Curated annotation (Swiss-Prot), chains A, B:
Keywords: Copper, Disulfide bond, Metal-binding, Oxidoreductase, TPQ. This is Phenylethylamine oxidase. It catalyses: a primary methyl amine + O2 + H2O = an aldehyde + H2O2 + NH4(+); 2-phenylethylamine + O2 + H2O = 2-phenylacetaldehyde + H2O2 + NH4(+). Binds 1 copper ion per subunit. Contains 1 topaquinone per subunit. Cu cation binds at H423, H425, H584. Catalyzes the oxidative deamination of phenylethylamine to phenylacetaldehyde with the concomitant production of hydrogen peroxide and ammonia. SUPFAM superfamilies: Amine oxidase catalytic domain, Amine oxidase N-terminal region. One of its GO terms (biological process) is amine metabolic process. Substrate binds at residues 288-299, 371-376. Belongs to the copper/topaquinone oxidase family. It comes from Arthrobacter globiformis. Its EC number is 1.4.3.21. Its cofactor is Cu cation; L-topaquinone. Homodimer.
Length: 620, 620
């Protein structure tokens, strides 16, 4: 019944049939993206209309299309032909990955480069990487991938231990042409293996770990209804899934006594970029837009009980489309569970004699994706006290290079002759706010130091200041950890019992933002990553901070163009975009498989409730 | 056996007997501090010589003494008379707290102030607080406490809901004299109760929480030998307890194959200060040095299985001295257990076909202390991957005031007429480092941005720089979150297999440091709190960042005096002092009992190991 239900296999099958009957899904067509559209703003929307947005690629070279279909009515709403030289190429297709290695295997320049290095072409794996936009005029309007080579000594070998430096190739994957092969010089291929399941490397496995058993003998405290609607400890929300963004949370609300109070209308990770900081021409173009170029939802892992998710686990198995419109299930792709989270509140009072302890809990919604060498876990947490938190967990195998004789200012050494280029992992959270409703504003809160003097004779006072962001042109903000800077999202029309506007405070980790030069290609294409906080006025079509078509788009799309409209955001329907990331100088301990590192943000109530919201938690 | 074993009841009784026999502990004497001294530098050395340091107060007004005793030999090693007007007063005695309310109840100025407010003296509780050093010349050399009043409507009432603003009194607790009673005017006493166990306020308790059961069917993975020596998943350490500092960690080492490698010789929270930012004369003197003035270990809670600590718990019950030298056991005062900690490492490789997942765990060592209205949890974590982390959990009841009718820039409103002054909670971690031995150095690491141009034509490169701190005068450092600043502790004489010095990296939370005016009394007494990182050369008597005697001591001791020696710290036996804290602008949700908020720091290996140290973790 819910407009926010997960897409079903039958819905995707019907999209396929509609596209087919309409003549838009011939044998030369490929679906590069398919997803359900959210309902438009309408607090009286009764008629069910499930609409899907599709990006259709053409393998023969014809122009691609963007199509919207109504599966409820069995109709095509609109279909637009795309000029990709202007608006950007479609996301990379899974089937285009294999094409790069196969094309290069018959190119005489590639084979000559491998022969000079005494490498058997049958053992050379090619990582197919997005191209970006640089100096090659012949690439505009063409679907390009760039390839970097790694040697696999045997079929179960970790090829990442054996980069082939000094060599890169560019490939047109539509016309199947190798456009350039660049060979800058012979580097030794690092010889040590990185096989983290080889006993020669692990040594004898530990026998000292005893089991930790986490069970819920009466079942979990949350309920799931309608497939994806969660109720847990006064929280209410819908768990969505999109092939581009991954897990999306809808309609996050909190039951405060009799009233269901909205907090966040839609929360997602709307982009994530991995820029590399090695100036070598072999890699200086390397920037992954994992969400926008690759689509992180389509590479989601099936999560194994007891290994990936421990405890009493409830799974969702989202359905996506393959390249031909057939539904594909990602079995056990989302884990949901609650877990103990230590002490919530504690006080032992001398005067009253009362000793009081309560425990905390959090609800966890998670999925994991794998893009080539990297694996990312996305975790949303809901706490008893009203806190919402997101955490990204980065693991996998670091991207490698040769370690140059004489060292490097931009590459870490991991093993003899083996390097790991410096890079960042930067995320954009898109938070469509609805604090007690849609009339919201953002205030920037700084600590204020005060000077010793009249009214502050002992020099102990300090205070704080709040600045309302009133228009989009002034709503591009930077972190300031030294002044304790946070941002408050409030509803000026909804007051708590002290007659103060209700609000939530955003706490950032204050990690560095994009380090690249402001004139670089990546700074233009990932402009969102240069500032910690952006606020826009809500609009239906302003979905991603990098625009709809990120692959090989020249720049400026997304947030810089939205913000230019300079719309009123003071007590309006607004969207908060928070940039946060990890700056990774790889360490020896990251090799040959990297222990998890984390980054995130959290939102805490700030006078949203009339008192602590967890006074009714029992002692248990 | 071990020189680092916990003090036993018999050792404390023996100290009492030695002091009595020596004539230093007659009926007018009180023990204000007693603790075991760590062994001096040198392996083996004294075979076994357990020495105790004692601060002895005299209730007749005679000069107090500092005494060192050898319990092994039954001798007084040294005993020195203290001039407290010079070097500071002794820590506050538990028995002195009761004195304050009783003395005020018979003072006619106090009674007249209460009569003006129609308050029954039998219902007025007085919070006895440390005095600091301000403008009152008559306090020099006297033991003073200051008292703030709260009304308790009935014996089980939370008095914190009913502050009596406009009133403060100062008390000489040795001569039993009320020195001053200051009344700046009548404020309404806030009338709403704050009784968080009253059903009228909690409402009906939730029935929705189902149990989470955490068990270890084969017992825990760690072993405890010699009372306090822990071995867990390659870690080795001794858990100490001191009545001033609380839990102290000794001899933290990691078993790397055949070798036990030292990392940290001694880790403790060596001071913690809570300064208030309300310029009202009623509270502008208010600064708690919970460690140095009150002694946090003295007020450690007994922790209840299933509520405070959940899982398979191993307890330690440390013994401290009471004011007469009798041993007192804090039953179940320290909880130890291991916890699942999610995914450790994960990769699904397309080319090799291998899917790999391992889970993380951490060892937890914790205790909780209650100082009046506040309750603090101290948590040390050891992780499988070599990470060490500390986290402080702040909860309890916020300190209250009236909320002035026309508002305030320095106080939050929590309830009608009820305010909560702004304050900070600032900690000092003292890390006596021993990275692969005692020859250590500290490097500050900043990210370096690079300009687009020759050698960086695409404007993508970024790098980092490390600056060695060579002398104490240059080792007072500030955070810089914008440049990703961290500090590396390395051993220049111990190299990993890549011929790089082994090291650990300190990751700070980059929260604001002390906000008070640098000319204030608190900035002089808590000078450590004005900077994020200090490095000193190890010395036996440089134990606390505030000096030995903090109570009513002006500036002139502690870290600023230590670093003036300007000692060589480049490849030497060094101590890192890290300041970190919370800046608390109280919110409505903090009332009437505060949900936990947290702050901390972590240390991660940085080329300490030759590869990932968790390759031998099993799947299971
Ligand atoms: Cu990385
Ligand atoms: Cu506080
Ligand atoms: Na040291």
């Amino acid at each position: 019944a819910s407009p926010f239900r997960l897409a079903s296999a039958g819905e995707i099958s019907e999209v396929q049939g509609i596209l087919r009957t309409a003549g838009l899904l011939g044998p030369e067509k490929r679906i590069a993206y398919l997803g359900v559209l959210d309902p438009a703003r309408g607090a009286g929307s009764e008629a069910e209309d499930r609409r899907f947005r599709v990006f259709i690629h053409d393998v023969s070279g014809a122009r691609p299309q963007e199509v919207t279909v109504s599966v409820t009515n069995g109709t095509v709403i609109s279909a637009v032909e795309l000029d990709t030289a202007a608006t950007g190429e479609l996301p990379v297709l899974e089937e285009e990955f294999e094409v790069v290695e196969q094309l290069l295997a018959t190119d005489e320049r590639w084979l000559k480069a491998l022969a000079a290095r005494n490498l058997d072409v049958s053992k050379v794996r090619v990582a197919p990487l997005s191209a970006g936009v640089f100096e090659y005029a012949e690439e505009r309007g063409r679907r390009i991938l760039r390839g970097l080579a790694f040697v696999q000594d045997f079929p179960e070998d970790s090829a990442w231990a054996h980069p082939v430096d000094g060599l890169v190739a560019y490939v047109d994957v539509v016309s199947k042409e190798v456009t350039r092969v660049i060979d800058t010089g012979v580097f030794p291929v690092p010889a040590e293996h990185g096989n983290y399941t080889d006993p020669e490397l692990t040594g004898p496995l530990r026998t000292t770990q005893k089991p930790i058993s986490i069970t819920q003998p009466e079942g979990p405290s949350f309920t799931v209804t309608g497939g994806n609607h969660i109720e847990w400890e006064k929280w209410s929300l819908d768990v969505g899934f999109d092939v581009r963004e991954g897990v999306v949370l809808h309609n996050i609300a909190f039951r405060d006594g009799d009233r269901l109070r909205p907090i966040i209308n839609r929360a997602s990770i709307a982009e994530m970029v991995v820029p590399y900081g090695d100036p070598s021409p072999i890699r200086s173009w390397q920037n992954y837009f994992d969400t926008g170029e690759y689509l992180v939802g389509q590479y989601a892992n099936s999560l194994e009980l007891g290994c990936d998710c421990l405890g009493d686990i409830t799974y969702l198995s989202p359905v996506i489309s393959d390249a031909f419109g057939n539904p594909r299930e990602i079995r056990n792709g989302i884990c949901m569970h609650e877990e103990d989270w230590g002490i919530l509140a504690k006080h032992s009072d001398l005067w009253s004699g009362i000793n009081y302890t309560r425990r905390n809990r959090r609800m966890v919604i998670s999925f994991f994706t794998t893009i080539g060498n990297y694996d990312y876990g996305f975790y949303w947490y809901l706490y008893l006290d009203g806190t919402i938190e997101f955490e990204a967990k980065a693991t996998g195998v670091v991207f490698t290079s040769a370690f140059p004789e004489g060292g490097s200012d931009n590459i870490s050494q991991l093993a003899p002759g083996l390097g790991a280029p410096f890079h960042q992992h930067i995320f954009s959270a898109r938070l469509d706010m609805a604090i007690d409703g849609f009339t919201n504003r953002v205030e920037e809160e700084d600590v204020v130091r005060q000077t010793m003097g009249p009214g502050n004779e002992r020099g102990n006072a300090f205070s704080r200041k709040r600045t309302v962001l009133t228009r989009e042109s002034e709503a591009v903000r930077e972190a300031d950890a030294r002044t304790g800077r946070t941002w408050i999202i409030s509803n000026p029309e909804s007051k708590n019992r002290l007659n103060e506007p209700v609000g939530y405070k955003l706490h950032a980790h204050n990690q560095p933002t994009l380090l690249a030069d402001p004139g670089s290609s990546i700074a233009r294409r990932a402009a969102f990553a240069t500032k910690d906080l952006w606020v826009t006025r809500y609009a239906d079509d302003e979905r991603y901070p990098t625009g709809d078509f990120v692959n090989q788009h020249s720049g400026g799309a997304g947030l810089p163009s939205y913000i230019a409209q300079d719309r009123d955001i003071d007590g309006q329907d607004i969207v908060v975009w928070h940039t946060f990331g990890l700056t990774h100088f790889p360490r020896v301990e990251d090799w040959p498989i990297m222990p998890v590192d984390t980054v995130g943000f959290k939102l805490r109530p700030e006078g949203f409730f009339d008192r602590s919201p967890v006074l009714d938690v029992p002692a248990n």
